Design a protein around this motif. Structure first.
Motif, PDB file in Angstrom:
ATOM      1  N   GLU A  60     -54.655  91.151  78.767  1.00 52.34           N
ATOM      2  CA  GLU A  60     -55.408  90.899  79.994  1.00 52.34           C
ATOM      3  C   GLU A  60     -55.130  89.484  80.497  1.00 52.34           C
ATOM      4  O   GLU A  60     -56.050  88.696  80.718  1.00 52.34           O
ATOM      5  CB  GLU A  60     -56.908  91.107  79.763  1.00 52.34           C
ATOM      6  N   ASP A  94     -42.478  98.069  83.452  1.00 52.02           N
ATOM      7  CA  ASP A  94     -43.445  98.926  84.123  1.00 52.02           C
ATOM      8  C   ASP A  94     -43.780 100.117  83.231  1.00 52.02           C
ATOM      9  O   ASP A  94     -43.062 101.119  83.217  1.00 52.02           O
ATOM     10  CB  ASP A  94     -42.910  99.403  85.479  1.00 52.02           C
ATOM     11  N   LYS A 153     -50.583  99.609  76.730  1.00 54.59           N
ATOM     12  CA  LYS A 153     -49.955  98.294  76.701  1.00 54.59           C
ATOM     13  C   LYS A 153     -50.356  97.513  75.454  1.00 54.59           C
ATOM     14  O   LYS A 153     -49.499  96.979  74.750  1.00 54.59           O
ATOM     15  CB  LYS A 153     -50.318  97.507  77.957  1.00 54.59           C
ATOM     16  N   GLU A 177     -39.975  91.942  82.518  1.00 57.70           N
ATOM     17  CA  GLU A 177     -41.134  92.776  82.803  1.00 57.70           C
ATOM     18  C   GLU A 177     -40.838  94.245  82.522  1.00 57.70           C
ATOM     19  O   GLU A 177     -39.700  94.697  82.666  1.00 57.70           O
ATOM     20  CB  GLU A 177     -41.573  92.602  84.259  1.00 57.70           C
ATOM     21  N   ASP A 195     -54.264  88.392  83.297  1.00 56.96           N
ATOM     22  CA  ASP A 195     -54.834  88.112  84.609  1.00 56.96           C
ATOM     23  C   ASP A 195     -56.195  87.427  84.513  1.00 56.96           C
ATOM     24  O   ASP A 195     -56.656  86.814  85.475  1.00 56.96           O
ATOM     25  CB  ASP A 195     -54.959  89.407  85.413  1.00 56.96           C
ATOM     26  N   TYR A 202     -47.028  95.741  82.503  1.00 58.46           N
ATOM     27  CA  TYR A 202     -48.027  96.111  83.504  1.00 58.46           C
ATOM     28  C   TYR A 202     -48.112  97.617  83.714  1.00 58.46           C
ATOM     29  O   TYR A 202     -47.145  98.353  83.512  1.00 58.46           O
ATOM     30  CB  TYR A 202     -47.748  95.411  84.840  1.00 58.46           C
ATOM     31  N   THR A 235     -51.188  93.166  81.638  1.00 57.79           N
ATOM     32  CA  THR A 235     -52.066  93.042  82.794  1.00 57.79           C
ATOM     33  C   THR A 235     -52.123  94.358  83.556  1.00 57.79           C
ATOM     34  O   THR A 235     -51.120  95.058  83.680  1.00 57.79           O
ATOM     35  CB  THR A 235     -51.602  91.925  83.749  1.00 57.79           C
ATOM     36  N   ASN A 236     -53.301  94.693  84.068  1.00 57.98           N
ATOM     37  CA  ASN A 236     -53.460  95.913  84.847  1.00 57.98           C
ATOM     38  C   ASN A 236     -52.896  95.728  86.248  1.00 57.98           C
ATOM     39  O   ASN A 236     -52.585  96.698  86.938  1.00 57.98           O
ATOM     40  CB  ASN A 236     -54.932  96.322  84.932  1.00 57.98           C
ATOM     41  N   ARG A 237     -52.760  94.468  86.650  1.00 58.69           N
ATOM     42  CA  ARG A 237     -52.366  94.118  88.006  1.00 58.69           C
ATOM     43  C   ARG A 237     -51.300  93.027  87.988  1.00 58.69           C
ATOM     44  O   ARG A 237     -51.620  91.858  87.773  1.00 58.69           O
ATOM     45  CB  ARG A 237     -53.587  93.649  88.798  1.00 58.69           C
ATOM     46  N   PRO A 238     -50.024  93.398  88.200  1.00 60.30           N
ATOM     47  CA  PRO A 238     -48.984  92.364  88.208  1.00 60.30           C
ATOM     48  C   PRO A 238     -49.170  91.349  89.333  1.00 60.30           C
ATOM     49  O   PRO A 238     -48.981  90.152  89.112  1.00 60.30           O
ATOM     50  CB  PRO A 238     -47.688  93.163  88.400  1.00 60.30           C
TER      51      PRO A 238
END
Ligand code: AGS
Ligand code: AGS
Ligand code: AGS
Ligand code: AGS
Ligand code: AGS
Ligand code: CL
Ligand code: CL
Ligand code: MG
Ligand code: MG
Ligand code: MG
Ligand code: MG
Ligand code: MG
Lengths: 546, 722, 196
Positions: free
Chosen positions: C107, C170, C53, C168, C109, C46, C149-152
């Motif tokens: 992506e 960062d 990514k 995960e 999400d 993320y 994902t842009n948003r965890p």
């Protein structure tokens, strides 16, 4: 072994109503045809889970010997589209064919929840189907549609219209006497030990319903079994009757069962006759008689008030220093009349969601209206008065309680008592004539009362002979009833410490009281008293400028 | 009954060749802790073990490890016939062989790695046909005794010649695996796993007896707890240990299939489970199938919930099936499932405590050769917020570290590594610290329920308060006899009040430790953090968590921060806490302690009789107490003999315990300066204490004290006019 | 011209972590079969958009030489109910066939957003489909599911459980050093003036 009225306890009055509604139309179908009078169409049973709604329905069926078609809610809503509505049709059709019949829709809220709550169409359609089938009873072919729910509200109001579910029965949670009953029903087949006091069980079993008690009896039994099991055999596929008789369920087994006891319904607004009496309250003899003249007379002697031309007052306000028996008096008078009693504390009113806080006060006044004669008690009003100014929500609730007060007709046997340790911030609206206009001042106990309180709290306790409660009362002048109970508690706590340390047998004696008095405190200051004494006279004027 | 019959119980001694009989029975059979006994189980099979003494073990039961338990073809809660076996004597030859699926991956010298140290000086009493388990090389291999020379049973003295025939053997049909899940693979859930064992064992093991009695058994058992707590593990364990048929209903798997296929699989599940009774239907991730009906739009989803409910109500069949279910969130579950006859029983499988974590760590280090510098108790102790799965990953990662570095050269090009290397491979304490560094704890934010590690010895002075506290909490729990005979019901709650940093929070924990009772601490800001709508349903959740963890003390610390926030949200919380206090039945042994550094703004409602009516005042420490505090803080520190802790207490006759702790740190922080700058013999001496004392710190003014003493005498009067 | 670790800058530490997690399990697949220890299953990456990514995922695939099946979130959720769940099965199936492999769900999400936000039966079914497939890797084939994902906090928490996306990384915005590093990688083909 099948279900009957003998398998039901705690629902005396309710079960009598259902019997009256159903007996004539079912046992005498031919007679009712001849009269032309209209019988009840639908009977809705509501109350929390495990109170015996499905039971009573199945009981009424066997006892009247009527044809019984069970419509399980979840069962319908688990099936496909048309098959749901198609089964609802068949259920009525078959019930009508074998009249007299009773259709029991269990968990009605599953089929017809709030028509606004539901999302979709097939759901709304099933509700419509039901409303039609209920209206379709204009054939009248002696069918009675019973139904059970835990959500009396969530049911689409359309169902509670006239000609559908027009009669309702609150099968609420049982009280002390009711729980004792149910315990006897489920311990009916057990060989109870002599030390088993089912009365004790019923009394310290506050928040249990019928299902809880049934499991509680089952719990104590399976524990007593597991014990004398010990050796048994197990390898043998079955145990003989000889063993099962030698098996006894000790009071200890019930106590272990009460340990794992998870009460189903707590905070569910309780409606019962308080077990508190005048004997539990020291002093206040004048106020006690005053309470009777306000509550005892208008219910036991309506002929007098009607002939005298006056209508009785509605409510009372207890006000005075903290811990002087305001909660006790409220419960006491209700017990004297043997009338039901509902105690809503101030904080309980400030707990609800903002939206529910209005629709739930109505529930209260309705529950009191139905449980009439009843004493609706709003305790700890001070905690609310503080939440309005800081001495939002508390504003909405009180205004609701005011509206509900005025709306309630005086010809009903509901009597409202408010109480607060602080009349300096009480809403004057509550004190206006027609509401809580009977302003009763409950002060600190005089010397005579203090002795009465001391004896009342030490009643069931082993106090020594040399202990002088009258002298003790002489010393605790400005003390309250709550304080005197705490001194007793403090003195008793010391006696226990001696018992464990020395094993001298339990005697709360003199020096225990003397030291407790050494640390004793006065919970009501002199300045506080002077104020309460002022409000004992001038609280009448708080509706003006004041 | 003759003494020769006993019931199978769990094993304390984790060794394979061993059983445990109580001493009263031990001497009754005239057989001693040293001798070798013969176990005769069901299916007409036998096994040999060394019998030993357990103080905990009830005489009528016999503790045997799952391995022996498996060879006898017996379960927990079955009878077996034990008898002495002096007939046994030393061994000449033994012919063991590995089972195929327990060696798929490795190859090499099993004798030197597994068999040699396993029987080294062990004089194990084996038997022909027995299957034993040896752990080493990061796996567990199963061998079966094919033949012995003093057959069928003999002992493995150091002179015993251990033969390996040649090739691994296939698995027999009736022979269960030891890699399968069992109660021995679960730790930290002692009490919870006990409950479930009681609920499930009687109806499943002896279904005929429950049919005969007429009594109603449990229908549904709902397991909840955060992710990775071992809900799926416990469910799968009870299945194998009770030996009941196991049909797994995986939540997502059902809901991943088309509309009708989901409901059809639900039927087939209950159908096949009922067919193969006794059975356990385990609905894993239940919230996937039956979330709150309001929470779900659509039609099918609501139809699936209704389908599950009907199936659950379909236990009118009572064909001996138990429906277990696991969710990570009770309030997500459609409450219609909680009703009686469905999921009426619940078990809170929360996060493990320090001891529980140590347990789990021992379970996942079973197959590894730990280095001597490894202190697993330290790992567990410095692992606040990990769950069963986190620890299982921690051990797995520490192992992967030892692997990849001592990989060094290895071979890699070779498709497999032999058992010689894997055994010689050790996992250092260093590797655990590395694995602990990359630790991502799952449940830090979770409110903790455990026995506090703080004791009275950590609290200097307050000897009076300690003793009064013992009366209020310990007596009513340990001596209900007295209270019932005296006719008084105990008080429910206490309120600590006084100047800041005088041990209010310590006392709350310290008493919970004295009673060895559970402890829950909700600080004021924690309550004001909560989302407003959920705030209420979560306060209720607290009191339920405390109600179930009974005996427990519910501690509301830092109440002043809430009193400030009132004078909106802070109002609803307390008024509900007041409501929840009342609902707390006195008989439940849940004792609610409150604490605040400010009694001038407490909602007097909290002080009403029946609630927090025991107003205990904790002041600044007198000289005697200050020394006790200073000693209590410097207990674990290397102080010089020259330091005069007494004199330090003489001067500071206005300092709180929080100050004295800060002073002891400051002096230590100076000693650390010296240790780093000059590498001096590390020890905190005087001149640090004196300099740290020069600057001083009075965290409680004089005017503050006067007020606190004023409230110490007048606080009960706050319920009237203030 | 293919992507490699040399095409990535500003993610030195993160790229190392991913190298550890991923590297052993693929050319030590028979080894893990021999050890019996549990390696990582899902590595969730993320960070804000355009951070690298998708780059890092493709790089790890080419540098380790593992088979690479790209699952673009929007591409799945663009298709009909049948195709969506079907392509998810095909991807996991073909990835298990050509082990060692890396299934990259870019992506994520888009496929499995917060279930509270999700509506419609088909979408909730696709999430459940993915959850089952992730649980399907507990067969312990030699397969790793990377995802971006842009948003965890947008991802359905069901995916963050044990056995699924349990690890995960960062991959955040680069600092001054990282930006210098990236600039070098994109100016390595250009003739720069001296004043640059
Ligand atoms: N008033 C009662 N008297 C005797 N037993 C009762 C009573 N109420 C409940 N029980 C017992 O508890 C069980 C509850 O059964 P039910 O009739 O299904 O109650 P219920 O109210 O219909 O349950 P719900 O509302 O659907 S959760 C009964 O089978 C009884 O054994
Ligand atoms: N007249 C009394 N006789 C016996 N006990 C009393 C009396 N008054 C107070 N008490 C004690 O005080 C307790 C509370 O009585 P309450 O009726 O609640 O007084 P109150 O006016 O409501 O004051 P608070 O604020 O609730 S303590 C009782 O449980 C008794 O222990
Ligand atoms: N209580 C425990 N004791 C020992 N090991 C455990 C425990 N809990 C989990 N583990 C380990 O972590 C793994 C996870 O177990 P699970 O049963 O899947 O947890 P879980 O609660 O079911 O996770 P959910 O509910 O699917 S999010 C187990 O296979 C063990 O290896
Ligand atoms: N009697 C004591 N014995 C040992 N340490 C103490 C004592 N009193 C205070 N402390 C120290 O003060 C710190 C805080 O303890 P607390 O119990 O939280 O005091 P407090 O009354 O809650 O005041 P605050 O608001 O938390 S600082 C602890 O870390 C102790 O180190
Ligand atoms: N750390 C990096 N080093 C060198 N180039 C990078 C780096 N990160 C991103 N880029 C460039 O950004 C482009 C690719 O970025 P992507 O990895 O596709 O974006 P992303 O991280 O996947 O974000 P989203 O969610 O797809 S918009 C290429 O031109 C890369 O060269
Ligand atoms: Cl008011
Ligand atoms: Cl407060
Ligand atoms: Mg029912
Ligand atoms: Mg009161
Ligand atoms: Mg699980
Ligand atoms: Mg503190
Ligand atoms: Mg990308």
């Amino acid at each position: 072994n099948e279900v009957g009225y003998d398998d039901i306890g705690g629902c005396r009055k309710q079960l009598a109503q259902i019997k009256e509604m159903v007996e004539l139309p079912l046992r005498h179908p031919a007679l009712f045809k001849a009269i032309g009078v209209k019988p009840p169409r639908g009977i809705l049973l509501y109350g929390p889970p495990g109170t015996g709604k499905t039971l009573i329905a199945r009981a009424v069926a066997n006892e009247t010997g009527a044809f019984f078609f069970l419509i399980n809610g979840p069962e319908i809503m688990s099936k496909l589209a048309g098959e749901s509505e198609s089964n609802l049709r068949k259920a009525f059709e078959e019930a009508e064919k074998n009249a007299p019949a009773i259709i029991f829709i269990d968990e009605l809220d599953a089929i017809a929840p709030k028509r606004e709550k539901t999302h979709g169409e097939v759901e709304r359609r099933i509700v419509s189907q039901l409303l039609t089938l209920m209206d379709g009873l204009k054939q009248r072919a002696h069918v009675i549609v019973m139904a059970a729910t835990n959500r009396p509200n969530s049911i689409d109001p359309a169902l509670r219209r006239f000609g559908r579910f027009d009669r309702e029965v609150d099968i609420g949670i049982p009280d002390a006497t009711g729980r004792l009953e149910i315990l006897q029903i489920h311990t009916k087949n057990m060989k109870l030990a002599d030390d088993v006091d089912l009365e004790q069980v019923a009394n310290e079993t506050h928040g249990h319903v019928g299902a809880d008690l049934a499991a509680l009896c089952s719990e104590a039994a399976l524990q007593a079994i597991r014990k004398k099991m010990d050796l048994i055999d197990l390898e043998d596929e079955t145990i003989d009757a000889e063993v099962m008789n030698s098996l006894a369920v000790t009071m200890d087994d019930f106590r272990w069962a009460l340990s794992q006891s998870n009460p189903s319904a707590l905070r569910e607004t309780v409606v019962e006759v308080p077990q508190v009496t005048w004997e539990d309250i020291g002093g206040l003899e004048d106020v006690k008689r005053e309470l009777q003249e306000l509550v005892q007379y208008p219910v036991e002697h309506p002929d007098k008030f009607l002939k005298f031309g006056m209508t009785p007052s509605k409510g009372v306000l207890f006000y005075g220093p903290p811990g002087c028996g305001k909660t006790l008096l409220a419960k006491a008078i209700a017990n004297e009349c043997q009338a039901n009693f509902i105690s809503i504390k101030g904080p309980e009113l400030l707990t609800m969601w903002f939206g529910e806080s209005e629709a739930n006060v109505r529930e209260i006044f309705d529950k009191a209206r139905q449980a009439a004669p009843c004493v609706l008690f709003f305790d700890e009003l001070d905690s609310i008065a503080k939440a309005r100014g800081g001495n939002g929500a508390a504003d909405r609730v009180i205004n609701q309680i005011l509206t509900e007060m005025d709306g309630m007709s005086t010809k009903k046997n509901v009597f409202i008592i408010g109480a607060t340790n602080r009349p300096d911030i009480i809403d004057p609206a509550i004190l206006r004539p027609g509401r809580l206009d009977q302003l009763i001042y409950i002060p600190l106990p005089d010397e005579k009362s203090r002795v009465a309180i001391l004896k009342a709290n030490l009643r069931k306790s082993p106090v020594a002979k040399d202990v002088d409660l009258e002298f003790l009362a002489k010393m605790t002048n400005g003390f309250s009833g709550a304080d005197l109970t705490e001194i007793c508690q403090r003195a008793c706590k010391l006696a226990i410490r001696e018992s464990i340390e020395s094993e001298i047998r339990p005697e709360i004696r003199r020096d225990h009281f003397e030291e407790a008095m050494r640390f004793a405190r006065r919970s009501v200051s002199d300045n506080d008293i002077r104020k309460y004494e002022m409000f004992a006279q001038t609280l009448q004027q708080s509706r003006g400028f004041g | 009954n003759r003494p020769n019959r006993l019931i199978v119980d769990e094993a304390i001694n984790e060794d394979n060749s061993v059983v445990s009989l109580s001493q009263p029975k031990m001497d009754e059979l005239q057989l001693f802790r040293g001798d070798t006994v013969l176990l005769k189980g069901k299916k007409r099979r036998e096994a040999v073990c060394i019998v030993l003494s357990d103080d905990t073990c009830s005489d009528e039961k016999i503790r045997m490890n799952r391995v022996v338990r498996n060879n006898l073809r017996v379960r927990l809660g079955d009878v077996i016939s034990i008898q002495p076996c002096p007939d046994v004597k030393y061994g000449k030859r033994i012919h063991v062989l590995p089972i195929d699926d327990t060696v798929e991956g490795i190859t090499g010298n099993l004798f030197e790695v597994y068999l040699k140290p396993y029987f080294l000086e062990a004089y194990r009493p084996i038997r022909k046909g027995d299957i034993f388990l040896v752990r080493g090389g990061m796996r567990a291999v199963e061998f079966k005794v094919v033949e012995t020379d003093p057959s069928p049973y003999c002992i493995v003295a150091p002179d015993t010649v251990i033969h390996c025939e040649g090739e691994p053997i296939k698995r027999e049909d009736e022979e269960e695996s030891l890699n399968e899940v069992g109660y021995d693979d679960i730790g930290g859930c002692r009490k919870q796993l006990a409950q479930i064992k009681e609920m499930v064992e009687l109806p499943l093991r002896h279904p005929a007896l429950f049919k005969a009695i007429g009594v109603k058994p449990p229908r549904g058992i709902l397991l909840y707890g955060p992710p990775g707590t071992g809900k799926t593990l416990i469910a799968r364990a009870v299945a194998n240990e009770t030996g009941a048929f196991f049909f797994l209903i995986n939540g997502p798997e059902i809901m991943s299939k088309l509309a009708g296929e989901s409901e059809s699989n639900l039927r087939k599940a209950f159908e096949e489970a009922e067919k193969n009774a006794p059975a356990i239907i385990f609905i894993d991730e239940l919230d996937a199938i039956a979330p709150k009906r309001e929470k779900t739009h659509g039609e099918v989803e609501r139809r699936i919930v209704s389908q599950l409910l009907t199936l659950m109500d379909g236990l009118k069949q009572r064909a001996h099936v138990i429906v277990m279910a696991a969710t990570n969130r009770p309030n997500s579950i459609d409450p219609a499932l909680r009703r009686f006859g469905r999921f009426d029983r619940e078990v809170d499988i929360g996060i493990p405590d320090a001891t529980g974590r140590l347990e789990i760590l021992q379970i996942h280090t079973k197959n590894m050769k730990l280095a001597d510098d490894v202190d697993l108790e330290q790992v567990a102790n410095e692992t606040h917020g990990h769950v069963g799965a986190d620890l299982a990953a921690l051990c797995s990662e520490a192992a992967l570290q030892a692997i990849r570095k001592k990989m060094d050269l290895i071979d890699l090009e070779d498709e497999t590594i032999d058992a010689e290397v894997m055994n010689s491979l050790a996992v250092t304490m260093d590797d655990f610290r590395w694995a602990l560094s990359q630790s991502n704890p799952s449940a830090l934010r979770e409110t903790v329920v455990e026995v506090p590690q703080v004791t009275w010895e950590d609290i200097g002075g307050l000897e009076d308060v300690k003793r009064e506290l013992q009366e209020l909490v310990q007596y009513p729990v340990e001596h209900p006899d007295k209270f019932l005979k005296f006719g008084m019901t105990p008080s429910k709650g206490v309120l600590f009040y006084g100047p800041p940093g005088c041990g209010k929070t310590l006392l709350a924990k310290a008493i919970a430790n004295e009673c060895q009772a559970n402890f829950i601490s909700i600080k004021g800001p924690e309550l004001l953090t909560m989302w407003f709508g959920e705030s209420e349903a979560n306060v209720r959740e607290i009191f339920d968590k405390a109600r179930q963890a009974a005996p427990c003390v519910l501690f509301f610390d830092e109440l002043d921060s809430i009193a400030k926030a009132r004078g909106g949200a802070a109002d609803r919380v307390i008024n509900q806490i007041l409501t929840e206090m009342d609902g707390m039945s006195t008989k439940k042994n849940v004792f609610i302690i409150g604490a605040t550094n400010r009694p001038d703004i407490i909602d007097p409602a909290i002080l009403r009789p029946g609630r927090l009516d025991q107003l205990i005042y904790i002041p600044l420490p007198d000289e005697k107490s200050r020394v006790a505090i200073l000693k209590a803080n410097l207990r674990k520190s290397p102080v010089a003999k020259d330091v005069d802790l007494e004199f330090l207490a003489k001067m500071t006759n206005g300092f709180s315990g929080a100050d004295l702790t800060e002073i002891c740190q400051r002096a230590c922080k100076l000693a650390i300066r010296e240790s780093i700058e000059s590498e001096i013999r590390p020890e905190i001496r005087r001149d640090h204490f004196e300099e740290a004392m020069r600057f001083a710190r009075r965290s409680v003014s004089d005017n503050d004290i006067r007020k606190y003493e004023m409230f110490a005498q007048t606080l009960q009067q706050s319920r009237g006019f203030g």
